[PDB]
């Protein structure tokens, strides 16, 4: 057995569900009335795989554009990121691609990036097709899953996928 620590950053447009995703993963909780994040929140949680305890130090950033220039302070030295969009919001997916780009240009060369298509419980209001997002993920070596912080769908799974990919 052994313990590996990694800094992980959550990025994406306001209200896509970043704080909900991480609350689900960390606490097994979800709030319908979750408050918009001011600045950034710190959280931590572990997964275990292949005898290895993988400990995430998580920075949950405020998505509001006014906080854009603070983001690089939080993804400095981050070994993983989750860029989150809202499947019911195609524009949130456009903003997600621009976060992925910024990460490619400005983050550590080793960063493992996951893409979350969140609020997938609202699939009857889907605006972003699964295969479009998958194609974008595949083309950029991103780990992509549709998640729902509300139901818990694929929440643990996305963090486990990151852990697998990280150098251990």
């Amino acid at each position: 057995n052994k313990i590996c620590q990694f800094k992980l950053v959550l990025l994406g447009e306001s209200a896509v569900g970043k704080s909900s995703l991480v609350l689900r993963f960390v606490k097994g909780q979800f709030h319908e009335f979750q408050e918009s994040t001011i600045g950034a929140a710190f959280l931590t949680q572990t997964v275990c795989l292949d005898d290895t305890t993988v400990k995430f130090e998580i920075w949950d950033t405020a998505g509001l554009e006014r906080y854009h220039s603070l983001a690089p302070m939080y993804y400095r030295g981050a070994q993983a990121a989750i860029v989150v969009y809202d499947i019911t919001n195609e524009e949130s997916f456009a903003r997600a691609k621009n976060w992925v780009k910024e990460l490619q240009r400005q983050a550590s060369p080793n960063i493992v990036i996951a893409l979350s298509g969140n609020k997938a419980d609202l699939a009857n209001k889907r605006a972003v097709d699964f295969q479009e997002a998958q194609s974008y993920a595949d083309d950029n070596s991103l780990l992509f899953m549709e998640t729902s912080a509300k139901t818990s769908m694929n929440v643990n799974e996305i963090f486990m996928a990151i852990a697998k990919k990280l150098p251990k």
């Binding site: 994040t37 710190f42 949950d60």
Partner: protein
Amino acid sequence: SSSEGFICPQCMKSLGSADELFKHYEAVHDAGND
């Protein structure tokens, strides 16, 4: 010390505003100074 706000990711110092955070970071964590 709140787990949310304008926290410095380097020393976990909680600052009162974004500007105070940028100020703090540049004075203590950037390349000696600037």
